[PDB]
């Protein structure tokens, strides 16, 4: 799987923004596909996941209710709308591909190379 990050900048706390994910590969509906963020000196952390074939979005706490994943399927695009910004939501924001291995965790074999966002 091959993915690519856009949309970052530089936005006013309070605000919105909208990144997006476009991905592409052999089977790619197969895979899980995630959010990923790493603020400056701090650890990556999982922000949300969808898998193709479900409505259901799985969010990290630090996020659920303000950042929404969403899909278009003719473009193969994953999104992240992000709402309601906080400072503490400056970040390198990544997506990523792994299997949709059921009955195990997702491992995430594929990524992006970022698109970075800072919140004042």
């Known amino acids: 799987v091959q993915l690519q990050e856009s949309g970052g900048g530089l936005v006013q706390a309070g605000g919105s923004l909208r990144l997006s994910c476009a991905a592409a590969?052999?089977?790619?509906?197969?895979?899980?596909m995630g959010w990923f963020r790493q603020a400056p000196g701090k650890e990556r952390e999982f922000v949300g996941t969808?898998?193709?074939?479900?409505?259901?979005?799985y969010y990290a706490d630090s996020v659920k209710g303000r950042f929404i994943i969403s899909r278009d399927n003719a473009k193969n695009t994953v999104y992240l709308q992000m709402n309601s910004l906080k400072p503490e939501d400056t970040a390198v924001y990544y997506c990523?591909?792994?299997?949709?291995?059921?009955?195990?965790?997702?491992?995430?074999?594929?990524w992006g190379q970022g698109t970075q966002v800072t919140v004042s």
């Open positions: 990523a591909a792994g299997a949709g291995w059921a009955g195990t965790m997702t491992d995430y074999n594929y």
């Open positions: 590969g052999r089977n790619l509906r197969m895979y899980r």
């Open positions: 969808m898998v193709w074939s479900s409505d259901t979005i």
